[PDB]
Design a protein around this ligand. Structure first.
Ligand SMILES: Nc1nc2c(ncn2[C@@H]2O[C@H](COP(=O)(O)OP(=O)(O)O)[C@@H](O)[C@H]2O)c(=O)[nH]1
Ligand SMILES: [Mg+2]
Ligand SMILES: [Mg+2]
Ligand SMILES: [Mg+2]
Ligand SMILES: [Mg+2]
Ligand SMILES: [Mg+2]
Ligand SMILES: [Mg+2]
Ligand SMILES: [Mg+2]
Ligand SMILES: [Mg+2]
Ligand SMILES: [Mg+2]
Ligand SMILES: [Mg+2]
Ligand SMILES: [Mg+2]
Ligand SMILES: [Mg+2]
Ligand SMILES: [Mg+2]
Ligand SMILES: [Mg+2]
Ligand SMILES: [Mg+2]
Ligand SMILES: [Mg+2]
Ligand SMILES: [Mg+2]
Ligand SMILES: [Mg+2]
Ligand SMILES: [Mg+2]
Ligand SMILES: [Mg+2]
Ligand SMILES: [Mg+2]
Ligand SMILES: [Mg+2]
Ligand SMILES: [Mg+2]
Ligand SMILES: [Mg+2]
Ligand SMILES: [Mg+2]
Ligand SMILES: [Mg+2]
Ligand SMILES: [Mg+2]
Ligand SMILES: [Mg+2]
Lengths: 703, 205, 82, 85
RNA sequence: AAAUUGAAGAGUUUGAUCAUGGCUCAGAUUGAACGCUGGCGGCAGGCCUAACACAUGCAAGUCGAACGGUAACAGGAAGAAGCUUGCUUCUUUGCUGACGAGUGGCGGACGGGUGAGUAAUGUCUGGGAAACUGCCUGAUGGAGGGGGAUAACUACUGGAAACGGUAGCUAAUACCGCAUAACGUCGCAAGACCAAAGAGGGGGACCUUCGGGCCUCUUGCCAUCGGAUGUGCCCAGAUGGGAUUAGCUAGUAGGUGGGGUAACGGCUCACCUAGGCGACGAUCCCUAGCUGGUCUGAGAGGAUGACCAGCCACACUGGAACUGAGACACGGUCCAGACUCCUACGGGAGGCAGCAGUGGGGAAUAUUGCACAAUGGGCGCAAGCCUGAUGCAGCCAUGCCGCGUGUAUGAAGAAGGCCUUCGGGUUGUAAAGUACUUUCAGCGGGGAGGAAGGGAGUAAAGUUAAUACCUUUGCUCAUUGACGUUACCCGCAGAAGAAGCACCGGCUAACUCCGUGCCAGCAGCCGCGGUAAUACGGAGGGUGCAAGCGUUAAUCGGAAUUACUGGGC
């Protein structure tokens, strides 16, 4: 039945900052597990993981791809373990892709660069891992690049991210002279071989260029893994060194609780270091049953609604980490079975969506490539064609299984732009595409606000929104140019009041009736009422027919409803009919509303209203070094501010800025803050602004 | 598929009694049955040839509780059949199961007979039929099922089935809850006001 | 191999086969040389469930026509002993 | 291919090789008889006809050609050799 | 016996009339679409356009009772693993069940698809002669004897794969000669010539080289004449429009001889004649699969060829063939093209108009489903295996049919609406209220039939030489249904969960008010609206149909308006 025992299952992720070596290392992995014949390189576009056309050209990974391998060991020490690796993007534009993937993975290998180490996306992913609480190990790649420091990078992790790291392999030699690594357990040096692409290596004599720090850090290591129990410590404090095996099992334990992180160093591009990390993925990372069970909600919660022992015997339960788009079936849902067995054709129940789904073609994957499999065991990551309702993060399970899994949380789109097919009428074709791609990214949203006719596309980043646009030109092909969102202006009287009036000679003898009103304008104030359509009924001269005395404010609503000044609605405006004229035979309503319409028109000009644009309450966090520049930029924009507040890990800025303003604020923020800031817009009360555009957009139609 | 509305509206639109009500109270005392149901019913629309044909056809449809589809079928058959088209049509209309139920009691109205047929409260020769259009065959017995027998409504309908022209083709048993269909009604065994030839020309127009 | 097989006419969930002597190539419902009686599988009534045409079946099987499994079973049942 | 109709492809090729062998041999014997008949030696042509006859009849038996084709060869050749004198 | 019994008009030219004449409406029908609305069941239906391009998954295998054999599982055999001479399981042995790959046989030409091509090489009807036909069936026989290979395999080897090399082999129902065969072929005759294959089951012997030999039966093999079947061929009639297509044709028409075909044939070659077709429409051009039938019609006729069935044709485009009884071959070969995919860059793979499905095009057409339980089909001694045939299920009011959405009662003829001559009327027994029922939906429980068979045991005979072993025909036994939470039946609760669409000037059934004022708008036709609009919009009311309604599109009718029936100058 089960090809590989659950204990011989590793589900790992490669998350790190941009260009940290995450994709290259997976290529070295696909090479040193024999699954791929050529090592490859990203700049050449050769990398398999980047299958997407954009990813090949830009070298960027714009999606997470999952692949598996069998690393028996570096010495064929173990029977082949199936390492499920989910390589992830590190571009903050695509942040769902790391988190969508992160909940599913059991362990994380977080890459770092020896020149830089912790860089901004690196903290971002660290935070993501902490929320899904993945036990982590680390690979510090680029140790073949000047500025390379294993030691310094370790400190960087401790100083910045917050993690306390235990060295596993120190480094033999400098950046150009990176011969290989020194284990702090085997006490060996795996000097790799240049002629072969790292395929062969030699365990060596631990030379004196580096034989002394090794002792210090080996000693520092024992102490920390020995920091797992007094049974180790009583012997450790017995002055005796505990066995490496007790250290390695102790190591696996400390990683599970996240007490320590294990740091491995190598150079994927230099084809060195990669084979050992794949070995240490076996050594400390968690197997599906090497930690406690998935938990659940049952029937609005229970004592232990789900304590699903990940097993080939427990009832089927899963999570759809990702929905992806395939043009021929129309979807591909990536699922990890937390507990259970599912087979081709098996029905599943969408615990979250309360529905029935049939799994038509379960497949396994090598990035883009897919291999159909009849059944999926627990702890296996697979892609399911034939599933049409599962949202990213929605549990798919057998009936009577947990309703809710922990992955119900996702980021908020930060950039908004609008789009138009060249052909004005390809708008639905364009529209459907935006929708499909919106299913795949819970972070790409398409809402065509009905205030204006514009199609609005919201996304986590400027690249994302562009990577999300070339996909439309390429798949679901449409040609579309992006632009600016429209303007949601409004208006209100300032203070002026009169006894204005309107009148048509509806009689003429033959016509037979007429209507006329004397009105009285006032504003309330910008934001005193919930009911912007304020009013007072007074009339006691020319008292219009009674059966529609109260029915003569709602017909007037259709002026406050939209557009008196420049095609923009009114707020807080108060109308007051006091006099008028009529005759109670049949005072025609549809031709009496002309009196009301000219009453509004004349009333508006005399009252000198104003125009108030949309302005919101922005809230920003940023490092306490970029305050001057972020506030200077807010100042360049028409922004007021709110809070003289400084956080402890930064500074919380509060600012009132326009809504037509701040187009592309996020990218400007990242630019001037070193991609280390977030923000939000609260849609606060509208405020007036002197604008050359408010009248040029109605003088566009002139009179 | 059933006219759920004011039956007396229909009746006084026809002017005549469609018997869409039980005999508990007179027709005038329940509805002002001389004027059309409208606010302009007091007025008089001068008749047209189509007018009287449609009105007779609708009278028959409203009497028997049949809709225009399946009434066109009751004409298609009895046009295919042999004999007089209109007579065969009236026979095919009296053969309906709610019809024979009504004419044998068990329901004071065709709609009560429809509910009787539909609620599996009837048994054409033991076999529970619940198709209100079941064209009952001669030499056949329709029997009320037990638990439908002795319900309050069936008894009242058996009692009220008198004061009415006794059908020359039924042989009810009134409490034993049997009732036969000894032979199909011929022409003269019915109201004789229904001019079936009008309907025939309506449908052959 | 001219067969004598059932032809599966009727309706959904209510079959009614027709014993047809047809070349074994043509489709079940398709072309046939001659029909020799019918067979109603679902009949549970006074009306005859099956009826064959034995003199012509014998003519065919003397000309070498193969008899299907159910048509053999129906010749059995037509005979009193079976 | 797709199915195991590739096996039939191999078998058809092999049978074509063999049939071409035998059909070439048979047609060569008939070429001999025709060259004799256009040479005029009724007795040499007769020997050639009696040499081809068992070949062509054996081939017809094998199925490489038809009984009718073998008989047609023999009839044509008898007619020719008889008018050959 | 019955197999029919069937034919309707109206509006509109006019100040009015009668004719002529067109337009329009009333009907029936649809693979429909759109709008609004939508409860259920049954049976059907479902890419009409791009024969446009196709990812993926299935759509053709089977036989160990032809053979060499042993890759996988199992049974055993020898154990000096495991061990308490083992129940606590080590390897070798095809030995046996069995079986991957391989040789071989049969199938793969069926079934499934689409209608591009095809105006006649096709189809339909009716005849005909110059033919072949696997499997199926009948009749008579044979079924001696022998050889050389060859895959699989071993070796070495090459390749990324696909897929190979190069020697050594190893069988056969694979191949080949011989012997033998005549109511078989050729030949007027004489005469000459042609085939084969064996496998399985048990057994009284009795013989061995535990190979078996031998006796049987069960199948299989070769030949010939038959049948059935299927197929090929010929003929006549009929089968579209255009003459704003009148000449066309040179293998062309025929004759002779050779060749070819299963078969006749310019089918073909070489001569020879100069014919042949054509106003009964040749030739060309456009269009088109044809038929039973479908719609319509009183008919005659008109339109059509979705479903279903018969024939034809095509398989990405063009060509050729090979194997074979059958093909010039959907899921075979080769080549040329365009296209797509794989590649380690050296090469390689493919053809959804099979079933689902995607894109696209379009007003518009469904699931990447479940079983082979039925019936068929291939293989097989069977068991069985395979079947996107087929049976079922899903989606969609797409159609037809059936049912429900309550029934009886109920005059303060309520309130409210609307009209009003201000009295009232209408909504309206309508509601509410009262009584009763619970179809269907929803829960819960029972539960046919599609299931025949097949298999194991049994007995009887037939069987032989033998109560074995095979049949065949009964008896018993356990059983086989995807649909399926089946149909249907029973109980539970309560009128709860279930009504909309169009219309109301005349044609045409069904009217008032208000607001509007030749505006906005309506209109199938006539026409409506410029101050009292039943023609627009709303409201109240009414009429028709109803889980549909209306609109658009399409066919016939009405239209005697292409008049053959059945018209006119
Ligand atoms: N010098 C050096 N370059 C490296 C190393 N690993 C990866 N790279 C290069 O870094 C660039 C981006 O690496 P990649 O793995 O695509 O980045 P990611 O996909 O963002 O992790 C590529 O050019 C790699 O060649 C290394 O160890 N040393
Ligand atoms: Mg780059
Ligand atoms: Mg990358
Ligand atoms: Mg209906
Ligand atoms: Mg299958
Ligand atoms: Mg085998
Ligand atoms: Mg079709
Ligand atoms: Mg040999
Ligand atoms: Mg042989
Ligand atoms: Mg000749
Ligand atoms: Mg013509
Ligand atoms: Mg065509
Ligand atoms: Mg006519
Ligand atoms: Mg195509
Ligand atoms: Mg051939
Ligand atoms: Mg084929
Ligand atoms: Mg195909
Ligand atoms: Mg379209
Ligand atoms: Mg079968
Ligand atoms: Mg009133
Ligand atoms: Mg029910
Ligand atoms: Mg049984
Ligand atoms: Mg059964
Ligand atoms: Mg009228
Ligand atoms: Mg209208
Ligand atoms: Mg119309
Ligand atoms: Mg008016
Ligand atoms: Mg005519
Ligand atoms: Mg005339």
């Amino acid at each position: 039945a089960r090809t590989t025992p659950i204990a011989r299952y590793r589900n790992i992720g490669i998350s790190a900052h941009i260009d940290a070596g995450k994709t290259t290392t997976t290529e070295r992995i696909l090479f040193y597990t024999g699954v791929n014949h050529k090592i490859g390189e990203v700049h050449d576009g050769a990398a398999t993981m980047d299958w997407m056309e954009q990813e090949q050209e830009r070298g960027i990974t714009i999606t997470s791809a999952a692949t598996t391998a069998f690393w028996s060991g570096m010495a064929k020490q173990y029977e082949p373990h199936r390492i499920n690796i989910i390589d992830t993007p590190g571009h903050v534009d695509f942040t769902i892709e790391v988190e969508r993937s992160m909940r599913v993975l059991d362990g994380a290998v977080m890459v770092y660069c020896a020149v830089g180490g912790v860089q901004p996306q690196s903290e971002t992913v660290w935070r993501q891992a902490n929320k899904y609480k993945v036990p982590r190990i680390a690979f510090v790649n680029k140790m073949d690049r000047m500025g390379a420091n294993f030691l310094k990078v370790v400190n960087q992790i401790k100083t910045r991210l917050g993690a306390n790291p235990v060295p596993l392999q120190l480094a033999i030699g400098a950046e150009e002279h990176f011969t290989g690594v020194v284990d702090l357990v085997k006490m060996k040096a795996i000097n790799w071989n240049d002629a072969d692409q790292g395929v062969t290596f030699e365990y060596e004599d631990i030379p004196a260029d580096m034989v002394e720090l090794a002792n210090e850090w080996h000693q520092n290591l024992i102490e920390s893994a020995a920091e797992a129990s007094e049974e180790l410590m009583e012997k450790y404090l017995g002055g005796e060194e505990l066995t490496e095996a007790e250290i390695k099992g102790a190591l696996r334990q400390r990683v599970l609780n996240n007490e320590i992180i294990l740091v491995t160093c190598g150079s994927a591009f230099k084809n060195k270091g990669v084979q050992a990390m794949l070995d240490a993925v076996i050594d400390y990372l968690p197997s599906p049953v090497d930690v406690p069970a998935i938990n659940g909600i049952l029937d609005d919660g229970k004592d232990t609604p789900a304590e699903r022992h990940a097993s080939d015997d427990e009832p089927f339960s899963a999570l759809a980490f990702k929905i992806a788009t395939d043009p021929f079936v129309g979807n591909l849902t990536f699922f990890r079975v937390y507990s259970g067995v599912v087979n081709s054709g098996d029905t599943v129940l969408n615990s979250v969506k309360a529905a029935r789904e049939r799994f038509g073609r379960i497949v396994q994957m090598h990035a883009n490539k897919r291999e159909e499999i009849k059944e999926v065991r627990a702890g296996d990551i697979a892609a399911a064609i034939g599933l049409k309702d599962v949202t990213t993060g929605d549990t798919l399970c057998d009936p009577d299984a947990p309703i809710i899994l922990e992955r119900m949380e996702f980021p908020e789109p930060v950039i908004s732009i609008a789009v138009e097919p060249k052909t004005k009428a390809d708008q639905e074709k364009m529209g459907l595409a935006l929708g499909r791609l919106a299913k795949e990214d819970p972070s790409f949203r398409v809402w065509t606000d009905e205030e204006s006719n514009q199609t609005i596309i919201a996304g986590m980043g400027e690249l994302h929104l562009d990577i999300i646009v070339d996909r439309m030109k390429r798949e679901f092909n449409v040609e579309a140019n992006v632009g600016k969102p429209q303007v949601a202006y409004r208006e209100t009287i300032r203070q002026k009041v009169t006894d204005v009036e309107g009148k048509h000679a509806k009689q003429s003898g033959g016509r037979g009736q007429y209507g006329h009103v004397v009105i009285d304008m006032y504003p309330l104030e910008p934001g005193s009422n919930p009911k912007g359509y304020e009013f007072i009924n007074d009339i006691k001269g020319g008292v219009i027919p009674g059966e529609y005395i109260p029915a003569v404010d709602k017909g007037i609503q259709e002026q406050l409803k939209a557009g008196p000044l420049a095609g923009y609605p009114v707020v807080d405006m108060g109308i007051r009919l006091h006099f008028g004229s009529y005759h109670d035979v049949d005072s025609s309503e549809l031709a009496f509303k002309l009196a009301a319409s000219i009453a509004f028109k004349e009333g508006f000009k005399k009252a000198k209203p104003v125009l108030l644009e949309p302005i919101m309450k922005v809230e920003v966090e940023t490092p306490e070094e970029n305050t001057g520049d972020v506030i200077g930029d807010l100042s360049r924009r028409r922004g007021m501010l709110k809070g003289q507040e400084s956080e402890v890990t930064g500074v919380k800025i509060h600012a009132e800025v326009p809504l037509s303003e701040m187009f592309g604020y996020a990218t400007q923020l990242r630019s001037l803050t070193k991609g280390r800031a977030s923000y939000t817009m609260e849609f606060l009360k509208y405020d007036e602004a002197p604008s050359n555009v408010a009248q040029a957009v109605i003088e566009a139609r002139g009179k | 598929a059933r006219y759920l509305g004011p039956k007396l509206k229909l009746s006084r639109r026809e002017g005549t009694d469609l018997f869409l009500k039980s005999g508990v109270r007179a027709i005038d005392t329940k509805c002002k049955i001389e004027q059309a149901p409208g606010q302009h019913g007091a007025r008089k629309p001068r008749l047209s040839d189509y007018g009287v044909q449609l009105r007779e056809k609708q009278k028959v449809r409203r009497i028997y509780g049949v809709l225009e589809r399946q009434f066109r079928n009751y004409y298609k058959e009895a046009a295919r059949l042999k004999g007089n088209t209109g007579e065969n049509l009236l026979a095919l209309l009296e053969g309906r199961l709610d019809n024979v139920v009504y004419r044998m009691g068990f329901g004071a109205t065709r709609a009560e007979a429809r509910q009787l047929v539909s609620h599996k409260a009837i048994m054409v020769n033991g076999r529970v039929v619940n198709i209100a259009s079941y064209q009952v065959s001669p030499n056949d017995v329709v029997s009320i099922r037990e638990k439908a027998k002795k319900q309050s409504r069936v008894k009242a309908a058996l009692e009220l089935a008198e004061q009415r022209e006794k059908p020359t083709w039924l042989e009810v048993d009134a409490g034993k809850m049997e009732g036969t269909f000894k032979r199909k009604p011929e022409r003269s065994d019915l109201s004789a006001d229904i001019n079936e030839h009008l309907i025939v020309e309506l449908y052959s127009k | 191999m001219v067969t004598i097989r059932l032809a599966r006419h009727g309706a959904k969930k209510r079959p009614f086969y027709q014993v047809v002597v047809a070349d074994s190539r043509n489709a079940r419902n398709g072309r046939f040389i001659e029909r020799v009686g019918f067979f109603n599988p679902i009949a549970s009534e006074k009306e005859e469930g099956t009826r064959l045409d034995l003199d012509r079946i014998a003519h065919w099987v003397g000309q070498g026509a193969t008899i299907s499994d159910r048509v053999a079973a129906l010749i059995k049942e037509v005979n009193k002993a079976a | 291919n797709i199915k195991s109709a590739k096996k039939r492809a191999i078998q058809s090729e092999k049978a074509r090789k063999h049939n071409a062998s035998r059909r070439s041999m048979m047609r060569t014997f008939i070429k001999k008889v025709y060259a004799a008949i256009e040479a005029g030696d009724k007795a040499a042509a007769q020997k050639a006809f009696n040499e081809m006859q068992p070949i062509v009849d054996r081939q017809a038996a094998k199925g490489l050609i038809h009984k009718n084709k073998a008989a047609r060869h023999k009839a044509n050749l008898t007619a020719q050799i008889n008018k050959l004198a």
